[PDB]
Amino acid sequence: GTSQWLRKTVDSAAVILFSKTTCPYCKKVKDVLAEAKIKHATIELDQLSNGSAIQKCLASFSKIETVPQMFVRGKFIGDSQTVLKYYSNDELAGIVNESKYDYDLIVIGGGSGGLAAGKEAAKYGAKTAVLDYVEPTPIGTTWGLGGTCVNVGCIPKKLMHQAGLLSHALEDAEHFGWSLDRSKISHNWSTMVEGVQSHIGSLNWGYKVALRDNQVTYLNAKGRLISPHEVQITDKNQKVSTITGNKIILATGERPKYPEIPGAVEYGITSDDLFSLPYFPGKTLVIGASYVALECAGFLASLGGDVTVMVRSILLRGFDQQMAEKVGDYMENHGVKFAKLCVPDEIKQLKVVDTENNKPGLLLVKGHYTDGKKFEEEFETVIFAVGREPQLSKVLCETVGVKLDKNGRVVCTDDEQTTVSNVYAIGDINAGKPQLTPVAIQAGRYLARRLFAGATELTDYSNVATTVFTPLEYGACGLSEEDAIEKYGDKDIEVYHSNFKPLEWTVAHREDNVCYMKLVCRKSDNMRVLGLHVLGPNAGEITQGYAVAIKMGATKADFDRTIGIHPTCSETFTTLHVTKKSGVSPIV
Amino acid sequence: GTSQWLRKTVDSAAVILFSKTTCPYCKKVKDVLAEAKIKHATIELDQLSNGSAIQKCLASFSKIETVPQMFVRGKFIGDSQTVLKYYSNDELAGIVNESKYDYDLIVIGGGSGGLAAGKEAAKYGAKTAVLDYVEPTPIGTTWGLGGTCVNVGCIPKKLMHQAGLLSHALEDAEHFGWSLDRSKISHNWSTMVEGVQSHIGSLNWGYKVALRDNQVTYLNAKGRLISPHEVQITDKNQKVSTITGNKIILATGERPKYPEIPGAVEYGITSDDLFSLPYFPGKTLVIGASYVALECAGFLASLGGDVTVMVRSILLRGFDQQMAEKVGDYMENHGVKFAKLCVPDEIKQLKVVDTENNKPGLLLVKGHYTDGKKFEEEFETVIFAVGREPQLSKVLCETVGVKLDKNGRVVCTDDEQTTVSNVYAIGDINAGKPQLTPVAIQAGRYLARRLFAGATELTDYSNVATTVFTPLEYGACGLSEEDAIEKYGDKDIEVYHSNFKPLEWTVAHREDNVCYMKLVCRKSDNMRVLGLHVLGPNAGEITQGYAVAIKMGATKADFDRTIGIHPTCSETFTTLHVTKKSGVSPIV
Numbered sequence A, B: 001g002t003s004q005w006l007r008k009t010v011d012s013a014a015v016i017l018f019s020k021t022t023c024p025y026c027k028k029v030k031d032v033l034a035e036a037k038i039k040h041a042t043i044e045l046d047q048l049s050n051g052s053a054i055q056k057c058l059a060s061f062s063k064i065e066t067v068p069q070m071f072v073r074g075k076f077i078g079d080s081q082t083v084l085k086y087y088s089n090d091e092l093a094g095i096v097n098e099s100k101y102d103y104d105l106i107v108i109g110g111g112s113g114g115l116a117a118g119k120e121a122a123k124y125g126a127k128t129a130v131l132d133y134v135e136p137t138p139i140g141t142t143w144g145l146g147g148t149c150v151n152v153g154c155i156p157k158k159l160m161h162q163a164g165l166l167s168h169a170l171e172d173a174e175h176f177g178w179s180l181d182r183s184k185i186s187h188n189w190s191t192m193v194e195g196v197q198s199h200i201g202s203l204n205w206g207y208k209v210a211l212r213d214n215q216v217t218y219l220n221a222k223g224r225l226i227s228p229h230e231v232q233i234t235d236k237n238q239k240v241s242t243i244t245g246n247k248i249i250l251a252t253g254e255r256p257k258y259p260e261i262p263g264a265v266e267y268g269i270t271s272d273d274l275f276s277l278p279y280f281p282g283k284t285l286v287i288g289a290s291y292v293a294l295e296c297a298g299f300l301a302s303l304g305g306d307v308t309v310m311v312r313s314i315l316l317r318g319f320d321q322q323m324a325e326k327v328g329d330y331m332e333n334h335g336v337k338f339a340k341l342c343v344p345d346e347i348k349q350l351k352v353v354d355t356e357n358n359k360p361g362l363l364l365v366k367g368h369y370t371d372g373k374k375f376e377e378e379f380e381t382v383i384f385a386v387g388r389e390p391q392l393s394k395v396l397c398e399t400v401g402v403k404l405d406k407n408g409r410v411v412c413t414d415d416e417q418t419t420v421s422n423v424y425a426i427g428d429i430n431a432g433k434p435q436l437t438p439v440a441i442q443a444g445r446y447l448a449r450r451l452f453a454g455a456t457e458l459t460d461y462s463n464v465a466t467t468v469f470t471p472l473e474y475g476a477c478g479l480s481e482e483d484a485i486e487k488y489g490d491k492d493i494e495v496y497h498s499n500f501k502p503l504e505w506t507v508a509h510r511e512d513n514v515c516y517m518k519l520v521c522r523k524s525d526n527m528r529v530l531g532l533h534v535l536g537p538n539a540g541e542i543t544q545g546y547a548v549a550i551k552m553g554a555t556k557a558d559f560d561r562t563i564g565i566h567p568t569c570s571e572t573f574t575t576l577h578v579t580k581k582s583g584v585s586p587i588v
C-alpha cells in the first residue's frame, strides 16, 4: 500500500525532500536550498499516519533511513552532508537541474487549467513550459494569454452582464429618490468593450508576469505531441522546433461550433467574436439555447438591443427544466423574443460590416418552424452558440495512443491520466467532466501536487455548483428534480420550494413571486439535500456557501436549524416548508 | 423519559390529535375537523422512535390505547366515535373552544418574534391574542404593526442602504458605457422616504391581514402582566380591561437609549425617527459606534450627506476588531468623517425644525476629545445610536416574579421559559441571546410548536451569522479571531485569509485589496472552522450558505474540496491558502 505510493512519488517529483519538523538537519538543508533559489517539494513525515512505514520503506530507495533525504527526478541525492557537499563545490545547480528532458512538465494550452497546473508545478521544482496559441476565428479575431474564460468567456461575459444589470439599477435609482433622466440615457457599446478589453489586457499581462515570476517558460507557439515525451512547436514565424518533457498536461479547451448552413461561417459570429466586437451588434439573432446563448441574448437586451433567440427544442438542456422555463419566462417578459421550435437554413448577406464607421452589416436569416411556417427576418448580427468542440486532431498525432471518445475528448482515469501514462488531460477536453473554469483550476493544481509533491487528494467532480448569468440569475448545486426522480423514484423524493422577493425589488416595483428556490431531498436518506436551485439576484453568491454543506451531506434539518441573515435573499433557504406533494402554492 | 415529555404535551396543547398514517380512523377524524374548521396539532406515532412507548404510556391519560385520541387543553375528549358523537349533536364547538382563560396564548408585543409565535400557535388550535402598541418617540413619531425590524430597523435601514449603493451604481454605469450626467444627478430624501414608508405601510397591513386570516385577535393596546395568567390592557381611549391566557409570551423588544446630556432628548433623534424623517437630515453627526451608527452614517454619506461619526472608544465593540477597522477604513476613505475618542457634553439648539418647508433645524454640539481639546461644531441633525434598552418595568408588575437581570432583560432557560412557568420570553429581551430578527422568529416559532404541538427541538443560538450593512458590507459567522485565541490560545489557532476584488469593481476602477476574507480555524480540532469573516459586496448573500456548513462542523478541508462558482466573490473561500502565521501578504 504505502510502497506503491512512495514508488510513484520518488519517480515523479523533480526536486523533493523528506523531513521532520522536530529534527535539526531537516530545518538545516531547507534554508540552504532557499538561499540557493532552488525550489522543491517537502513531505514532513512527522505529520502523516503513514510516516512510520515510509521512513522505513524509504530505505528501499536510498539505502538510508535518516532525515533529511533529497531526491531529484527519481534519484537519491543524499544526506545532510552530501548535499551541502554539492553546494560546497557549487555543483548543486547542474545536479538539481539536469534531466533527460528539457522540462519536468510541458503544459499544452494556456487556459484556466493549464496556467494553474503550470504555476503550481513550478512551485515544487518542476522545470515547466506553458505553450499557448489562439487560432483566429473565421473573421480573424484573436487574443492573448489566459484561455476561454479570461478572454472570450466568464470574464467579459460577466462584465457585460454587469453593464446590463446597471440598466435596471438606473431604472431602480429613480424610485429610490435619485433625479434621473431616463429620456436622455443611452448606452455606448464601444466604451464598454474598451473597458472590458482593457481589463482583459491586464489579465493577459498579469499571466505573463506570473509565469516569468515562477521561472516558467511561456511560448506563444502551437504545440503538437508527436511522441509521449516529444512536443513539436510552431511559432509566429512558422518556425518548427521540438522540445521534451517528462510529464505532459493537455489543456487546450474547445472552440465554438458552427452549424453547416450557407453563410454561417462567412456572415455569422460566435461568442469568440462577441466580446471584442468593434460595433454594437444591433438587432441580433442568437441561435442556440445553451447558457451561453441566453447569457448573451440577456445582456444585449438589457443593453437596449432588439434581441431574438432561435430555439431548436428546449432551453438549457441538461439543467433542471422547471428552472430553465422560469429563466426563459423572465427574459421573454423583459424584452427577449424567442422564435420557438425553429431552426436556421441559410444566412444571406444584405450588408457588409463597415470597418469605416464601425456599424454592423445586415443579414437575412431564412429558417423553418416545426409547424412548417417559414422563418425569414432581418438581423444586423447573428450569433451562434450551438455548442463547443475540442480541436485535438490538430494536437495529437494519433500515433501516440492518447484515446479520444466519440466527441473528440480525452478518456481519462479519475486522476486525469490519459492512455499514455505520462500524459494527463484537464479542463474542458477531459471527457465527462463539468466544463467550468474552477473545475479546471482545481484539477490542474491538485494534479500538479500529485506529480511533484507526492500529494494524494483527487479532484471531486460531484455536486459541482453552477451559475447561469442570465438577466435573472440561476444557481444550482447537485441534481435537477427530474434526475433525482429518475434515479430514486418519485415516491422517494420530497421537494421544498418557495417564491421570494428581494427587498431591493419592493421600492423598485419589480415582480412578486418570480424569484424562486427549491431543495430536492431524499425521503429515504434522512431528507438528504440532493439538489439546490435558486433563481434570483446574486444567485452565485447565494449558492456557493451551500455547496460546502451539500458536499458534507447536508439534510433538510441542517438547513432548518441554521438561522437566517436578515434581510437577504439567501435566508429563505433556512425557512422552507411548503412541499410540492403538498399541492400548496409556493407564493408569497 | 418519554413520559415526562407526554405529560407536558397533553397539558399544554390546546387541540391535539395522536394518530397513525396507516390506520383508517386516524385519517377519518382529521377530515371531519377540517370540515369543521377546527385547527389542531397532530403527532403521527408511526413516525417516532418513541411511538412504541407513547401509545402505551398514552393510556395513563385516556384509559385508552386506540388511535385516534384527541385532547383539548389537557383533557381527553375521546375515540373515533365520541368525537363524531360531538360533531354529531353539534357540540364540538364549545368543547374544543372552552378554556379556563380567554386564550391559550397571549403574546405581548407585535414584533418579529411575537407575530411569528402568535401565527404558528394559532396554526395548531391555540386561541391567540397579539397585543402591540408603540410608545412614541420624544418628538411624537409612531408607526404600525410589525416591530423594530419592519418599521424602524433592518427593513428601512436596508432600503436606504440600497439607495446609497445605487449612488455607486450611477458612478459605475459610466465606465460600463452608459451616457450619464453626473453633473445633473441629485438625490431627493422625501421621495425615498415615501417609497420606504409605502412598503412599510404594506407590511403593517399584511401583518394585520395575516392575523385576521389565522383567527388571531390583534389588539392595538398596551399590555401589563399583573398576574401569571392576567394581562391588563389599556387601549387608544385609555380604557382599561383585563384578559386571561394560559401561556404568555413576552416579545416587547427594546427602544433606543439617549445619553444624559442637555438637549439630547429635546434636539437629537434616534433611528426610531430617522426612517420616517420628513426632511433631509443634512449635515449630520452620528453619536455612537454600533453597527446601527455606521449603517446610518454610511448610507447618509452615500446619499451625498456631510456626515461625521463621534466615537467614544472603538468601532463595533463585540465584533472582530480587525474587520471593524477595515469597515471603518473604507467609510473614512469614502466620505465619512470620524471624530475619534470624543464624547458629547451638550447639544444646544440654533434653529428649530421647520415643519413649514420640511428642512432640518441646526444644532451646536459641544464635546471634548480625550486629548483635552474641545469639540464644537454645527450639525443640522444629530443622531444617537448609543445602544438600546428594554422597557419592562412598564410591562411586568414585578409582583409577578419574572426575574430580570442587571440590564433589565429576562432571565430564561434554554427553552425560553421565564421564572414564571407559563411565561416565556423571546427576541431582544431574552438575556444573553443574539439580538436579531431571524433569531426572534425561530425562537417564537419553535417555542410555539413545543407549547402546542408537542415538538421538542430547541432553538440553537450558537454560530448565528450576522451582516453589517455598511457601505462595504461585513458578514460573519462564529468567533472573532481574538475570541478564538482567548478561548484556545494562540498556538492552537490558524487563520487563512485573502484580499479579493469583485469583478464588478475592475471596469469600475474601484479598490484592489480592500475586500477581504478569513477563516479562523482550530489546529488541534482538524482545522475546524471556528469563525468566518468577509468584507465585500453582498456579504450577507455570501455568508449565509456557509453558516449551514459551520453548524455542521465544517473544517478547512471541507472548504478546499468544494469547487468555486466563477466569477463570484464567494468562490475565494474555496481556495484560501495564505496563513497569518506565514507572514506572507494576503494581497492580490
Ligand SMILES: Cc1cc2nc3c(=O)[nH]c(=O)nc-3n(C[C@H](O)[C@H](O)[C@H](O)COP(=O)(O)OP(=O)(O)OC[C@H]3O[C@@H](n4cnc5c(N)ncnc54)[C@H](O)[C@@H]3O)c2cc1C
Pocket (backbone or CB within 6 Å): A108, A109, A110, A111, A112, A113, A114, A131, A132, A133, A134, A135, A146, A147, A148, A149, A150, A152, A153, A154, A155, A157, A158, A221, A222, A223, A224, A251, A252, A253, A254, A271, A292, A394, A395, A426, A427, A428, A429, A435, A436, A437, A438, A440, B565, B566, B567
Ligand atoms: C461564453 C462562455 C462563457 C463562459 N462562462 C463561464 C462562467 O461564467 N463560469 C465558468 O466557470 N465557466 C464559464 N465558461 C467555461 C470556461 O471558459 C471554460 O470551462 C474554461 O475556459 C476551460 O478551461 P481549459 O483549461 O479547459 O481551456 P481554455 O480556457 O479554453 O484554454 C485552452 C487554451 O489552449 C490553447 N490551445 C489550443 N490548442 C493549442 C495548441 N495546439 N497549442 C497551444 N495552445 C493551444 C487555446 O487557444 C486556449 O488558449 C464559459 C465559456 C464560454 C464559451
Ligand SMILES: Cc1cc2nc3c(=O)[nH]c(=O)nc-3n(C[C@H](O)[C@H](O)[C@H](O)COP(=O)(O)OP(=O)(O)OC[C@H]3O[C@@H](n4cnc5c(N)ncnc54)[C@H](O)[C@@H]3O)c2cc1C
Pocket (backbone or CB within 6 Å): A565, A566, A567, B108, B109, B110, B111, B112, B113, B114, B131, B132, B133, B134, B135, B146, B147, B148, B149, B150, B152, B153, B154, B155, B157, B158, B221, B222, B223, B224, B251, B252, B253, B254, B271, B292, B394, B395, B426, B427, B428, B429, B435, B436, B437, B438, B440
Ligand atoms: C436600526 C436597526 C437596524 C436593525 N437591522 C437589523 C438587520 O439588518 N438584521 C437583523 O437581523 N436585525 C436587525 N436589527 C434588530 C431587529 O430589529 C430586532 O432584533 C427585532 O426587531 C427584535 O424583535 P423582538 O420580537 O424582540 O421585538 P420588536 O421587533 O422590537 O417588537 C416589540 C414590539 O412590542 C411593542 N411593545 C412594547 N412594549 C409593549 C407593551 N407593553 N404592550 C404591547 N406592545 C408592546 C413594541 O412597540 C414593538 O412593536 C436592527 C435594529 C435596529 C434598531
Ligand SMILES: C=C1C(=O)C=Cc2ccccc21
Pocket (backbone or CB within 6 Å): A311, A313, A314, A315, A324, A325, A326, A328, A329, A332, A338, A339, A340, A341
Ligand atoms: C419554455 C420556454 C419559456 O418559458 C420561454 C421561452 C422559451 C423559448 C424556447 C423554448 C422554451 C421556452
Ligand SMILES: C=C1C(=O)C=Cc2ccccc21
Pocket (backbone or CB within 6 Å): B311, B313, B314, B315, B324, B325, B326, B328, B329, B332, B338, B339, B340, B341
Ligand atoms: C479604527 C478606526 C478606523 O479605522 C477608522 C475610523 C475609526 C473611527 C473611530 C475609531 C476607530 C476607527
